[PDB]
Structure formats: C-alpha cells, structure tokens
Write a protein that binds this ligand. Sequence first.
Ligand SMILES: *[C@@H]1O[C@H](CO)[C@@H](O[C@@H]2O[C@H](CO)[C@@H](O)[C@H](O)[C@H]2NC(C)=O)[C@H](O)[C@H]1NC(C)=O
Ligand code: CLR
Ligand code: NAG
Ligand code: K
Ligand code: K
Ligand code: MG
Ligand code: TL
Lengths: 39, 992, 268
Amino acid sequence: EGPDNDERFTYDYYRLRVVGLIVAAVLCVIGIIILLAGK
Amino acid sequence: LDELKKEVSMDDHKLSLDELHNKYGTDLTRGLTNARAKEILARDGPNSLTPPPTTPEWIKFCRQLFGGFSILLWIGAILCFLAYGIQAATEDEPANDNLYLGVVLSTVVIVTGCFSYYQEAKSSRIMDSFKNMVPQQALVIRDGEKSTINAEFVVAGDLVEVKGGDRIPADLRIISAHGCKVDNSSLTGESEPQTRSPEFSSENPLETRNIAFFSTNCVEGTARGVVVYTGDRTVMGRIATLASGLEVGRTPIAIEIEHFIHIITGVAVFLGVSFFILSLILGYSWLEAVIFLIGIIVANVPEGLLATVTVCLTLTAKRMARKNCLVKNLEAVETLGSTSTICSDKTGTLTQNRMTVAHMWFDNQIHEADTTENQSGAAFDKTSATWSALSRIAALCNRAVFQAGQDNVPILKRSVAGDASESALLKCIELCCGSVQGMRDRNPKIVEIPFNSTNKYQLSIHENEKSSESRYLLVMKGAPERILDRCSTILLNGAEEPLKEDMKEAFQNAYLELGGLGERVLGFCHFALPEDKYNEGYPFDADEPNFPTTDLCFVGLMAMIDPPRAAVPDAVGKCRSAGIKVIMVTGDHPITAKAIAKGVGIISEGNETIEDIAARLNIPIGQVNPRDAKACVVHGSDLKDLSTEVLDDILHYHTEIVFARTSPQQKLIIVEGCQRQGAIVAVTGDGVNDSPALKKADIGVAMGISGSDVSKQAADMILLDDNFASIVTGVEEGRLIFDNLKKSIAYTLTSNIPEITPFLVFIIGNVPLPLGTVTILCIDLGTDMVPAISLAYEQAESDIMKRQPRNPKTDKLVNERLISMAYGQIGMIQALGGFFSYFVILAENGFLPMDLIGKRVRWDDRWISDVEDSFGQQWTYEQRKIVEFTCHTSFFISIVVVQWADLIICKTRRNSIFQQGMKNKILIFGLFEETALAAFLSYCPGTDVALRMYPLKPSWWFCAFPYSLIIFLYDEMRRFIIRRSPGGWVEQETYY
Amino acid sequence: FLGRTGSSWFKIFLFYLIFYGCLAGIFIGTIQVLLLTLSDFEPKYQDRVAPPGLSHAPYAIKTEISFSISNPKSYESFVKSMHKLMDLYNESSQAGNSPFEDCSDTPADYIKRGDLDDSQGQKKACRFSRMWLKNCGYAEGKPCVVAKLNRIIGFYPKPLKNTTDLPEELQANYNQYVLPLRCAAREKIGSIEYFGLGGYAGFPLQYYPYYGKRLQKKYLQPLLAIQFTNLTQNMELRIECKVYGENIDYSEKDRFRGRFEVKIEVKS
Ligand SMILES: *[C@@H]1O[C@H](CO)[C@@H](O[C@@H]2O[C@H](CO)[C@@H](O)[C@H](O)[C@H]2NC(C)=O)[C@H](O)[C@H]1NC(C)=O
Ligand SMILES: CC(C)CCC[C@@H](C)[C@H]1CC[C@H]2[C@@H]3CC=C4C[C@@H](O)CC[C@]4(C)[C@H]3CC[C@]12C
Ligand SMILES: *[C@@H]1O[C@H](CO)[C@@H](O)[C@H](O)[C@H]1NC(C)=O
Ligand SMILES: [K+]
Ligand SMILES: [K+]
Ligand SMILES: [Mg+2]
Ligand SMILES: [Tl+]
C-alpha cells in the first residue's frame, strides 16, 4: 500500500520455523523407516 | 634379545642316570635334602614364569593425543586461549568465542583419543596361559620320603614323581617308568600318547623317551625323574618368553592411517603458515593473524575422519562376529584382506584332529569312506556280504566305547574312551551299521587277547549271534602283513577261497597304495571254529594258545588318517585363486604332512619334490636339478642346520611348501622369513606350539573349539565354529573394507575445500566472512558423520577375490589420485556452490557482489552502526551480522546439498550408480538424517545463540542444487571414460 | 620430477586450466541470472533493516565519548567525524532547483514522488540547512551530539498518537508530523537541549519516503542536534537517546535499534 506498507518490512519467521521443524521431523521419521527395513 | 630363544635346545639325556646326578648334586633314590633343596631355591630362583613388563594404559591413551591431527587441533585449542588472553587484557571482550572454541577443540582431541585408543587395542595374556600349565603342587622325594610341595619350590636336582592325570611340573630326566605315556601335543601339536622310559632313544632330546617336558601331561602309567630345568629355563618356558616377549608391531591398516595423516598434516601446515605470512604482508594485526590461523587449522583437519575409520572397522567386525568369526583387535579386520601368504598348522586347523577310517580293502577292491565331519560324501558299499563280515570284526575286535550321555551329539564328534584307531573303527561301524553296542550284545565276548607289543595282533572269541549256530567265532586285527601270515582263505563276495599268490599280490598293492596315502593300515580276519571240536561249554585259555591262530580267513584291510575338515580343500583353492600363497607348517611327521598337503591342495596334482623326481627317474637326488621341483618338503632336523638366507631361497624357489616336524621357534622363523621378503602373512593354528608364530604373524587366526587357550591368546581373530571357510570370507571382507575406506575418506576430505576457500577469500578479497569456525565443526562432526560411515556398507564393484593381493608398498589407502579428485575437482565445485549461496543472501538483502570487495573493514567495525548497502540503506552492527550469520547457515546448508551428490559419487570408484544401484539403506538413512540435522540446526529456536545458525528462507535451500547436479554428472561422465578405456589417462589420474 | 614426467605435468595443466576456466564461466553465469532477478531501485528483502537504527556522528570508541575540556587534542578526534557529517549538509552542495527543493520550514507531511520507477528523473529531495542546528570547532565543553535515523527505501516513519500516556507527556506534541527523540539516563545529573528542523526535537516527515541511492542521489536525511550542557563533571554518564513511533522498535541485542548508547565524561 501507500503510507500503510508495513508488510514490506515484515517476515513470518515464526511460521517458517514451524514448517522447517515439521519437515526436519518428518525427514527424520522417513529415515528411520528406510533404515528399519531390516535393522 | 630373543634371538637366543629362536634356536633349538641343548640337553643331557645322553648322560647316564648316575652321571646326571653328579651334575645336579642329587640322589636317585633318596632325593635331595630339605636343606639342599632350599639352598638351590635361593640359588636358581622359583619354578615359575614371570610376565614381561607391559606398557600402562595411561601412556597408551596419551600417545594417541599427539598424532598429527591432534597436534594441529592442540595448536588451535591453545591459539584460541592465546587470542582470548590477549583480549581479556587489552579491550574487555564480554564474549565467549575464543574461550569456548578452545574448550570445544580440546574436547574434540580427547574424544578422538578414545576412538584411536579403542582401535589400537592389544589384548594379550600369553604368559598367563603358560603359567596355567604349571600345576599348583608336585610330588617330590626328599630325605627318602615323598611329599607334595608347591610346584614353585621345585628345583633342579630333586626327585619328582608323576602318574596318569598329572601335569609335568618341570623338565625331567626319566630315571624310572612303568607303562608311562605322555601327551606332547604342547611341543608337536599331536596328542597321541608318547611312551616315556629311562632309556635314551634319539639324539634329538625332543624325540627321546627319557625326557619329559613342562607344559605336557602324563596320560597313563607312572614315572620318576630328575629335574634338569626349572621356570624360564624349561623348553616351553622359553617358548613362553619368546611368545610373550615378541614385539607386536604396526598393522598394514595402521601404517596407511599414519601415511595420510602426514599428507593432510603437510598441506595443513603449508597453507597454515603460507597464509599466516600472507596476512601479515597485507598488514593484518597479530590479533587477527592468529584468528585466521585457528580457522585454517579447523578447515584443513578433517575432525571426524579418524573416528569414522574406527566405526567402519567396528561395523565390519560386527558382521564377522555374526559368522562365528571373533575379532579381538579391530585392525585385524583389514589385515586378512592384505594377506599375501598363509602359514597354516595342520592338526586341528586344516584337519579335524581325529583318527578316521579313510579306505577299506575287501573283495579285491579299494573302497573309500566319507571322512568329513558332517558327512558330505556318499556311500561306498553296503551290499557285499564281505562288508558285513569285516564290519563285524571292526565292532567285535574292539575295546573302545562312547562316553556316557553323548546320544545328543553326532557320532564323529562324541568323546570316546580308547586309543585313536579303535575309536575310528567304532565310529565307522556305528555310522553305517547302527549301534555297535547292539552288535556286542548279540555276540557275547567270552575270551580275548588284547593287542600285544610282541603279538602285533588282537584276537577275540564270541558267541555267534546266529541261532542256527550259536557257536564260537574268532576275530582278530593287527599289522596287515602279520594277519596275512595267519590266513589260508579269503572271504570273496561272500564265499571263502584259497589264498593264491594272485590275491596275495593284490593285497600288497592295496597295502602299498593306502600306505602311500599317508594312512595307517590294519588287517582284519576271522575264523569260524569247528563245532564238534568246540562244545557250547568249551573253555578257551587266553594265556596259552588253547585255539588255532593260523589258517584263518582274511576278510579285508582298513586304512585311517586324521582327515581334512570338509571346507578346507575348497578354502585353500579360494585363497590360491586370490593369489595368496599357502604354506604348511606342522610339528607332525613328513609322510603325514605331505599326504594332507595333496589332500587339501597345498601341493597341486603333478607337482614334485626333488625326492619325487629322483625316485621316478631312479637317479640320485644330487643328480636332480632342484629348479625342476616347484614343491618341497622340509624336515625340522634339516631346517635346523640351514641359515636364514638359505631359508629365503627355499621360500623364493618353491610355490608349494611343506615344513614338517617343525618346533615352535621354527614356525616363528618361517613366518619371519616370509615377512622378510616383504609379504603380509597370516598364521592359522590351534596349539600352544603355534603361539610364537601367531604372535609374529601380521594376523594370527586361532581355532575356537579345538584351539588351546594359549593359541587363542596369541591370535588376533578366533574362528568360534572352526569353520576354515571363514578365512576366505575374512580376506574378502578385508579387501572390501579397504576400498570402502577410500570412498569414505574421499567423501570426508572433499568437504574440506569449501571450508578452506572462504577463509582465503576473506583475506585476499576483504569481504565479509562467508563461513565460521563453529559452522565447520557442524559439518565434520555433525552432518558428514552418518553419510561417511554408510560407505562401509558398499557392496563390491567387481569380483575382489579375482584380483591379486595389494602391494603394501605401492597400493596406498590415500594417494595423489584421491587428493586430486577430492581437493582439486569435486571440493572445488562445492566451494563455488557455497560462495554462490553467500552472494545470493547478501545481494537479496541489499549488498550486491560488486560492493562487497574491501568492505570487511567497515563491516566488522562494531562502532559503525550505519553501513551503506548498494541501494543506499543504512545498517546497524547487529543487523548486518544477522545477515552474515544467515550466510554462514546457507553456506553450511550448501555443503550438505553438495555432499548429497558427493555421497552418491563416492559410492562407486569405477561403476556407475545406474549399475551399482541404491541398495545401501544405511547410505539413504544418512541422506535423510543429514538433511534433518541441518534443518533442525537452522530452524530450532535458540540455535542462533549457541551455534549462530539462522533460519533459511525456502529459496535459500536451492542455491547449491545446480552445483550438486554438476558434481553428479561430472563424476558420472569421468567414470564412463574410465570404463570405456582401461588404458590409463582418466584412470591413472583420478582412479582412487 | 616429483610426481610425473614433463608430458604428464603438461596434460595435468591443460586439464585444470580448461576445468577451472569452465567452473569460473559457470559461476559467473549463475551470478548473471541472480542479478537479472533483482531490481535496480529496490532490494528484494528489507525485513533485516526493518526497525530503523539510530546512529550519531561522534565516533564512539565503545559507545563512549570521554575527553578533557582543559585539553585541545582531547576532543579533536570526535570533531573529525562531527565535521565529516555536517560538511555534507553545506549550502554550496544544495544549489539550484535541481535536484533539490525548498520544503516547509516547519515539520510537514510525507511526499510521494510516484513509484520506485525511472519513469521520472532524479526524484527531488528536500533541502536541509545545517543552520537549523543551533549552537552547533564544536562544543569543547559539554558536547553537541548529532543524531540520525537510518535510511530505508519506502519507509514511512509514523509518530505515536496522543491517545494515551507518553514519556514526554504531551509537551510540544506535533502528533501529526514529528518523530520525537528524547534522551535520558534517577541519575538526572545533566541538561538536555534539542535542536532540529522547525525547532522541534524530532525528524520532519517531509523527508520521506526515501527513494534510494539510484533514484535519489545527493538526497539529505534530517538531523537532530542534541546538546548536553550538564552541570556535572568527571564521571561516566550513561545517556540513552530513544526515538518513538509506530514503526519503531528496540532489541536487547541490537543496542542501536532505534536508540543511542553514549557514555559521556568531561574529565577536566
Ligand atoms: C562545508 O562547510 C564547511 C563549514 O565549516 C567548510 O569549511 C570551511 O573551510 C574553509 C577552508 O578550509 C575555511 O576557510 C572556512 O572557514 C570553513 N567554513 C566556511 C563556512 O566556509 C567546508 O569547506 C565545506 N565543504 C565543502 C566540500 O564545500
Ligand atoms: C583457491 C584456489 C586459488 C586454490 C587452487 C589450488 C590448486 C592449484 C591445487 C588444488 C589441488 C592441487 C592438485 C592436487 C593433486 C595433484 C596430484 C599430484 O600428483 C600432483 C599435484 C596435483 C596436480 C595438485 C596441483 C595443484 C592443485 C590443482
Ligand atoms: C548558543 O549560542 C547562542 C548564540 O548563537 C547563545 O546566545 C546561547 O547562549 C548558546 N546557548 C547555550 C546553552 O550555551
Ligand atoms: K599377531
Ligand atoms: K570435511
Ligand atoms: Mg594343531
Ligand atoms: Tl575440516
């Protein structure tokens, strides 16, 4: 917007962290699954 | 020091009984005086063995703390505390950087110390096992009276008494004996009881009957003797010292490790000081000049590599534990793969160590029995009525019996009370005719004449199990020729017939052939006594010939030997196909040694000794060109008068070598001879007479079930199931781990470049620091760890058992070709991918690549809270630093992303991934966990403080992707060239 | 030689020359495409400069400016940087209707010169006289520090509204058009005096938004002179100058995030 362009200097680092941690966890689980296919 | 002990012993068995007493101030009848014995005790010292001085574990741990990488990491750790000290004095720095990094680095050294300490293990209790062979007490005659004393109180000169069941307390001169037999397997590896008597019977004291040795035991009878040697001075006490004293030495794998440590340490100190001066010339304060150096150290040293090696070794040892192959020393996991020569004991190693029936001669025909443990062969005969007649004599004319409670274990494995030949016959009949006890119940023995030294035969009279007869049957066995002189008829295919010169000659032929096979041959015959001349109550006199022992019916011959283990012939061939030379080294007699050599394939068909040529051509042995003989059989008595140079010529000039009737020191000498030629040597054995050789071997392998305690103490590896096929597996595993270590090392080293280059450009370019010191440790200690380990699970790219053993002088674990690829090619591509993401982060935040050159001065200036970017905006100190640390984070993640491809390319040295596939589940696990770790390290809240890791935007992850792909393509194209032309260019330049 | 023969030494050179040549050519290619995705007038991200920093002229050794009044070369270090900044706000530097403009001598509202486009020439910036900075060689005794708000493209600094309570409660509250700056230390052993545009202790909103170096060269940002004529002497005084606004925030880590950290000591 014009004088109300506050969103330009903002970033949702909170969501990014939530998503990043979700991904890291799921990649960790996936890895266990493939490894445990025989121990 | 031990050169004296490598020599054959000198003795006094040639002296008379009386003469021997003068030498030791002793009485043949009364024995020593209580006072004289105590005097000699203080004089000579105790009848005991002293363990050699060991190196304490303290010094062993700390010796690892100073080996190249640890030295550089120490210089870094201290240089951290240096810069910290210089700070705490000058400008009060409330930070924790240099202090904490110095603590972290010192911990890395200590923990890495534990890994190398675990790898360099030496579990040795040789002298302890020998000490277990000295009895607690001994029986001596002192002041004309026998008393039990502490065996350590035994001295040279006293009168000792032994009987069946006790250990020889010391080396004795036999002066009196009654039916005494002894087990000399300690000195020979052969357990057949040897008679002991006062009479001298051989110039060689290790063969004479009037000497009994410490480390052996009396098996039966009784004997008295004069002690000639005590403690360390006994024949086997010296073997003990020799074995326990032998310098261990460095393994092939250990030598390789130190070698690349020098290389990497070299480049480290080179670039280290090369850029330390390069910085001072650029006008960098010593305050900074050291900070850069610390970074250089951390970049160049692969912090997690030595521990990777250890884990890869451990994991390989775990797989072998699962095939009944125990590894006592982690490094011995690889030595077997580098082995070019095997020196093998015969008895209990190549052989089962059990007299077993091998052949039978009946119906004018040679039949072969199955000698294998698990009986993997086939039948020979069952139909012939002759067989049942021979079978009956083998069961009936036999005094051997199975021990109680064996019905669970297989026939051939069960313990038997009796001599070896009777046990063999027992197990033979029990196997192919069912319960022998049944045959001995159906035919009650009424009278017998046990085998006599003079008679040279054993006879028995039984009540024929037949109801229509129920009469008296006579059976006998003995020396083949003696049995022949007592026969008139031969049971041919059922019916008897006169013994014509024809069949008599066929007998001699059969007899000579079986004997030529190194087999012990016995004759078997029977005689159905006439009914009218022998009533159902007729008494037979065993003392005086009350019955005919002539004109009997010859039934057949039976031959026997201590046979090879089932898997041995095939394992020997497999070792030989892998280009490993196999030598036999045995305490056993030459005829037996040679026969098993041919049986297992040590001596291949057609190959001759000089003696064979001479007999065939009917010419003198001196007339034979010795170069025409590729095979040789050396008796220990001849070995004794040969110099090592002459032993070296024997080793060089023959492909098929048999060393027979060797002493324990002689086995050591042969091993050393092989090593002297530059060969990596394995020893396989099971007896205490293998202990020195096992110790000196680059790798000693002991048998687990049949092995003596001493042998297993002297070994690096134990075959827990006595499965000789495990040697073949071991060499295969050893070669595979050697290749996989290269892959894992290249992989680990490759990521050094993207950690070095940022520090260099930081100096030469004056740009903001692309990657931090902490960030490097997150790679080498964190992300790269599981992937690097996973390479240990790689399958072979080709048939490794088809290639020759590596040349330890030329074929190195880390060579110039590895460095060229890891440092010069792939690592260089990784460095760029790192920098790219760095320029991306900065440029998208407003600092375009052009304006970055020569800005670090203002960038690092803590007091400039208004640096201008390319777009004209102003940044505080902490603001721009957040972007900088975000650059460290994405550079870090870029390494991870480019290591994805590197992990896949390091999978194979030659083959394509499209050929080898992706069947390594540990490797795939590594990829997932590596990426999980990196993501966690970036996105987990609080990690921005502890590790300076900042959250990355999704687009950031993909910066290095095009570089990751170029790596995959590049290496795939390169290896395509290797395969397409075995010529050499790409091969001799980059082929690891 | 060391490794190989001359023929081999050559081939290994011909390779790495072509190899590294290609790699350099590829690296440059990826840099090209990166630049191609970026604007010339505005950076892709601005969240890392977001809350504006407040920086001053006196180059602090460590957020500190200690000196002796009874000594000449004791403050000549801080006068060097003070001069460096003010030397830019010269009248001879601001000449003609291009590219400067005379703007309200009293704090006014924002000025939009269109978009971040080159569809116009150099966007005309408001003039600023260093003569608006009353009282301030500089203050040889009791320094005359000069404040500054960090430039951010397209940033509209918004003052706080007088809805509730305020630190400098309602005094000279030019609510609509002034971004205030109140310095503080309890510990009240000083004498705060502020100088600026229109005589206000703030930044005139008529200098915003900044259009960037590419679209606005020679642009001048508003200054706020602060004088501490403290009646005290020979002691470290921790003085913090704070700016207030809707778009202004602070951090415990970044001690320059919309605020000062000055340790004055007139040890004379
Ligand atoms: C910006 O203004 C300052 C004001 O002090 C100028 O400093 C002048 O320097 C000259 C020569 O050194 C002196 O004779 C004067 O006394 C100073 N003041 C004035 C008001 O003229 C400085 O030269 C100016 N800078 C530029 C680039 O124009
Ligand atoms: C950051 C940049 C400027 C550094 C570049 C370093 C280059 C020149 C280095 C890195 C790895 C190096 C190579 C590594 C391996 C070998 C194989 C060896 O048998 C001869 C030297 C040779 C061929 C080296 C020559 C120089 C080399 C290519
Ligand atoms: C600032 O200077 C003016 C003259 O320009 C003078 O009248 C005044 O006293 C000075 N102010 C202070 C607080 O010293
Ligand atoms: K050994
Ligand atoms: K590394
Ligand atoms: Mg043996
Ligand atoms: Tl490293």
